[PDB]
Structure 1
Amino acid sequence: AKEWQENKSWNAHFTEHKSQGVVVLWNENKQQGFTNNLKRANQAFLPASTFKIPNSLIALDLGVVKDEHQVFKWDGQTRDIATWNRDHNLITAMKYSVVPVYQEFARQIGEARMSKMLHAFDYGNEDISGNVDSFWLDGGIRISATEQISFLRKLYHNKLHVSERSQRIVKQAMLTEANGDYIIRAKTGYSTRIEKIGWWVGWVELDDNVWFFAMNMDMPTSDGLGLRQAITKEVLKQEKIIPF
């Protein structure tokens, strides 16, 4: 039984944009996965921006974040992203990938509780070597695209070892697009520093099905998140998951 099928025709979406990477899709109803590259789908990388999901979940479950309205005041330090130089709540911190807010969450969670929770989540290699407030950006943690799918499916089903409340709040914060045809929950691909790999992970909710996606790509000459989203959407449109 092959729960993972390879479709090399999606490689054209990478080659036409002079890029190299993987797209992994999971059809929830059919319990079947699809990818352009099975080997790369299983290669583990630094989670970087995708770590906002487990970080926020742990912060809510432990009461570091009381609710999605609690204000995290700006520290007064001027940074190069204008949207970071203001107060935020969980929703806006996710919207604008406000790394200083997530660093504050990680410091409050602390090393021991962060490690215990990643082990409880079965999250990637569960290795958090590095500064407690930067290990997902320059430390020892690694996760593959197929492991991102397994983690996101548990989140979708409220099956992670954290409160149902924390899972519902994080899914609300992940909201990125909604129209009369579909909803996309993601808010995970923004790159805040130089990394070898960029990501885009999340899911597409349809009336009678959910399609999980996890993609990663090598750093190209100039393109980034916009391109990662474009290639993923080109694949979703090819598979008739979302309309053209």
Structure 2
Amino acid sequence: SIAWSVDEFFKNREGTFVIQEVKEKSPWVYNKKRAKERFAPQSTFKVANALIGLQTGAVRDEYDIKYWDGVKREIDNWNRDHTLGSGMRDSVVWYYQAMARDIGEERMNHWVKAIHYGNKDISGGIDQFWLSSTLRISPIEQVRFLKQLYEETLPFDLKNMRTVKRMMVQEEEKHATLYGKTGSGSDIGWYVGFIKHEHKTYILATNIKGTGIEAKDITYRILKKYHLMEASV
């Protein structure tokens, strides 16, 4: 068991860290107050959105191509054709908005409720509800959801859970694979996912007052401290 200590990574940011080995009964929590507070999921919702898009048949697989509509958006890399998988890696909002519209209100509502995704409130709008809007989920709830994704106990087809986990690969190392997703907006910084290291798997959520990139950085530093992730050798 790991004697977690992470205060040194949160000196300049208000934040929380939730982490749980999959055989452990409960997560370890830094800043329990913030860990139980629900926040807009921002781009971390792409994990659930992709599962639901695949389950409903709104998209075919991780290679389902959608065509750029020629509208120049804020991030250059968005201004080209994308797939479900490249859309998750590059957090391509327009792809996932198009998918959400195809899923539609009734199916999205059902599946968001079925997986107990925070307050389950998508009334903010079918392609808007996850960005600083009506839907909110706590860091503890993200870990509960991602634990079920990892252990394949969500009410999705096995194939769809395996597809989405492949789409989430963030770092590949000799003895580990990090899976995860950043979220940013309205000073809510997320990094959520799980790390497989040898025969142990840790489900995690980092949430700060700050950005997704900052949350991801904090996460890497914690995982490195405890040798779940290799150092920069």
TM-score range, shorter chain: over 0.9
1:82-101 → structure 2 map (5 Å cutoff): 82-101=76-95
Which of residues 142, 161, 168 in structure 1 aligns to 2:136?
142
Match of 2:6 among 10, 16, 41: 10
* TM-score (norm. length: structure 2): 0.93
Shift of the 67–150 alpha-carbon distance from structure 1 to 2, 3 Å rule, reads: same
Q: Distance in 2 between matches of 1:32 and 1:217?
A: 21
Cα drift, residue 40 of structure 1? 1.1
CA contact (8 A) 1:148 1:201 kept: yes
Instruction: Confirm whether residue 197 of structure 1 aligns to residue 184 of structure 2.
Output: no
Counterpart code for 1:130: G
Partner Cα separation in structure 2 for residue 163 and residue 32 of structure 1: 26
Secondary structure of 1:69's match?
A: coil
1:27 partnered with 2:21:
yes
Deviation of 1:190 (Å): 4.3
Rounded Cα–Cα distance in structure 2 between residues aligned with 1:34 and 1:190: 22
Q: Letter of the 1:20 partner, please give it.
A: E
Aligned partners of 1:87, 1:190: CA distance in 2, in Å?
22
Q: Which amino acid aligns with 2:203?
A: F
Cα drift, residue 138 of structure 1:
3.4
Residues 1:44 and 2:38 aligned together:
yes
- Deviations along 1:165-194, one digit per CA (max 9) or x if unpaired, are 1111111111111110210111x2143xx4
Deviations 1:49-103 (A, max 9, x none): 1100110100000111011222100011011211101111111111110000000
Calculate the TM-score normalised by the size of structure 1: 0.89
The range that moved more, 132-141 or 233-242, is 233-242
How many aligned positions are there? 230
Deviation at 1:125, TM superposition (A): 0.9
Quick check: 1:228 aligned with 2:215? yes
Share of identical aligned residues, percent?
37
With over 3 angstroms needed to count, the CA separation of the structure-2 counterparts of 1:190 and 1:197, relative to structure 1, is closer
Report Cα offsets for 1:110-130 as digits up to 9, x if no partner: 111111001110111111121
| 1:6 positional shift | 9.9
1:56 aligns with 2:50: yes
Q: Which runs of 4+ in 1 moved over 4 A?
A: none
- Is the Cα–Cα contact under 8 Å of residues 88 and 167 in structure 2 kept in the other structure? yes
* C-alpha RMSD of matched pairs (Å): 1.7
Structure 1 stretches of 5 or more lacking a match?
none
Does structure 1 residue 210 correspond to structure 2 residue 201? yes
Structure 1 or 2: more strand by fraction: 2
Distance in 1, Cα, partners of 2:3 & 2:72: 46
Query: Which structure 2 segments of 5+ residues have no match?
Result: none
Cα distance in 2 for partners of 1:144, 1:137 equals 15
- Take 1:239 and 1:173, find their aligned partners in 2: how far apart are those partners? 25
Give the letter aligned to residue 52 of structure 2: I
Q: Within the alignment, does 1:71 sit opposite 2:65 as a pair?
A: yes
Which of residues 157, 164, 178 is equivalent to 2:158?
164
Q: Pick from 97, 100, 112: which aligns with 1:103?
A: 97
